[PDB]
Each structure stands twice: as C-alpha cells, then as structure tokens.
Amino acid sequence: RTLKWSKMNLTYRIVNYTPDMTHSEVEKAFKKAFKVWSDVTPLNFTRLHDGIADIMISFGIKEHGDFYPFDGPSGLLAHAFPPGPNYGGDAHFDDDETWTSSSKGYNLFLVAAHEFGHSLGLDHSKDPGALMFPIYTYTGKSHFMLPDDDVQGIQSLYGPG
Ligand SMILES: NCCNS(=O)(=O)c1ccc(-c2ccc(CSc3nc4c(c(=O)[nH]3)CCC4)cc2)cc1
Ligand SMILES: [Ca+2]
Ligand SMILES: [Ca+2]
Ligand SMILES: [Zn+2]
Ligand SMILES: [Zn+2]
C-alpha cells in the first residue's frame, strides 16, 4: 500500500488570485494542470466556487497559516500537501514570486502540474526530464506532453483511464 486518494472524483477551489495574471489566465492554467493527470488516470476534477473542496488552492506570502512559511522573492516558490483531510491535498503558491503564462518568471501551469502531482501522492523524481524533478526549468516546448516517468508514477497509484 501507498498514500493516495480513495475517491476518483476530486474537487478544487481557487480561493484567491495572484495579481500577476488575470482571473481567466489563472483558471485556465490550473485547469490545464489537473488535465495533465486526468488524461492518464481515472481521476476527474471539478472546480467549486464556494465551500470546502478536496484540493484548496491559494496564493500567499510569508507566514500564511501552516508550518511551512514562504520567504519572499526567490527562494521557495510553492508547496502542496499529500492526500488526506483538511490541509491534505492543498496547494500554496508564494505570491512574492512572479507567476506567468510565458517564458518569464515561474510558469504557473508547469508549477501547478508539479505541485498537483504532490497533491495526488507523488514524490519527487530522479529523472531531470520528469515533471516531478525538484528543479524548475522551462523548455518552451511547442505543446506539452507529460513525460513517461511521471505517467508511470501516477498510474502506479490510480491506473490507466
Ligand atoms: N520541498 C522543496 C520545495 N522547493 S521549491 O518550493 O522551491 C520548488 C522547487 C521546484 C519546483 C518545481 C520543479 C519542477 C517543475 C517542473 S519543470 C518542467 N518539466 C517538464 C517540462 C518543462 O518545461 N519543465 C516539459 C515536460 C516536463 C515545477 C516546479 C517547485 C517548488
Ligand atoms: Ca519565495
Ligand atoms: Ca483539503
Ligand atoms: Zn503553505
Ligand atoms: Zn515539489
């Protein structure tokens, strides 16, 4: 046995938005991020506008209400908790960073896909070409294809769709 969600139908809520991007650009970016995993697993993700959801996403700075505070510009950038109740599964992004949909700063989609991998029970990868490798890089690929090391890893938890 490993650590994982018992249900295949998960809900997320975007609690607050970063000033660095428009509501629509944020929402598009996170939705594409969950799709990364939904496409290769039986998992399904639906967004809630209110109330408590399984994966609760928020932006914040410094001491933000958990034992893992951010540090301002540079340094740490996001973290997410493994599956479980309450804080379990949630994702936090440091809003002293610069979030973008481009080549500049941290690309919010890529970092969300990474952080959501942790939310589903994945650990970091040893393959520098994985999405779950602990070092951020931006490859500027024409379109994004989820690398094989990570499709293997998430499927070990949930199986193919
Ligand atoms: N517990 C340590 C936390 N350190 S952290 O907060 O500073 C941190 C560090 C790195 C990442 C992070 C690392 C890698 C990625 C993904 S990199 C990437 N993968 C792929 C492509 C690409 O262009 N870039 C193409 C396909 C796979 C995202 C976030 C997140 C938080
Ligand atoms: Ca930081
Ligand atoms: Ca939660
Ligand atoms: Zn946090
Ligand atoms: Zn990570």
From Swiss-Prot:
Chain residues that bind Zn(2+) 1: 64, 66, 79, 92
Localization in the cell: Secreted, Extracellular space, Extracellular matrix; Secreted
Chain sites annotated for binding Ca(2+) 2: 54, 86, 88, 90
Annotated function: Plays a role in the degradation of extracellular matrix proteins including fibrillar collagen, fibronectin, TNC and ACAN. Cleaves triple helical collagens, including type I, type II and type III collagen, but has the highest activity with soluble type II collagen. Can also degrade collagen type IV, type XIV and type X. May also function by activating or degrading key regulatory proteins, such as TGFB1 and CCN2. Plays a role in wound healing, tissue remodeling, cartilage degradation, bone development, bone mineralization and ossification.
Entry PTM: The proenzyme is activated by removal of the propeptide; this cleavage can be effected by other matrix metalloproteinases, such as MMP2, MMP3 and MMP14 and may involve several cleavage steps. Cleavage can also be autocatalytic, after partial maturation by another protease or after treatment with 4-aminophenylmercuric acetate (APMA) (in vitro).
Segment of the intact protein contained: 109 to 269 of 471
Gene (UniProt): MMP13
Biological classification of the source: Eukaryota, Metazoa, Chordata, Craniata, Vertebrata
Oligomer status and interactors: Monomer. Interacts with TIMP1, TIMP2 and TIMP3. Binds (via the C-terminal region) to collagen.
Record: residues binding Zn(2+) 2: 114, 118, 124, 132
Active site: 115
Disease affiliated with this protein: Spondyloepimetaphyseal dysplasia, Missouri type: A bone disease characterized by moderate to severe metaphyseal changes, mild epiphyseal involvement, rhizomelic shortening of the lower limbs with bowing of the femora and/or tibiae, coxa vara, genu varum and pear-shaped vertebrae in childhood. Epimetaphyseal changes improve with age. Metaphyseal anadysplasia 1: A bone development disorder characterized by skeletal anomalies that resolve spontaneously with age. Clinical characteristics are evident from the first months of life and include slight shortness of stature and a mild varus deformity of the legs. Patients attain a normal stature in adolescence and show improvement or complete resolution of varus deformity of the legs and rhizomelic micromelia.
Annotated binding of Ca(2+) 3, by residue: 71-72, 74, 76, 94, 97
Protein family per UniProt: Belongs to the peptidase M10A family.
Protein name (Swiss-Prot/TrEMBL): Collagenase 3
Region (Interaction with TIMP2) residue spans: 68-138
Domain description: The conserved cysteine present in the cysteine-switch motif binds the catalytic zinc ion, thus inhibiting the enzyme. The dissociation of the cysteine from the zinc ion upon the activation-peptide release activates the enzyme. The C-terminal region binds to collagen.
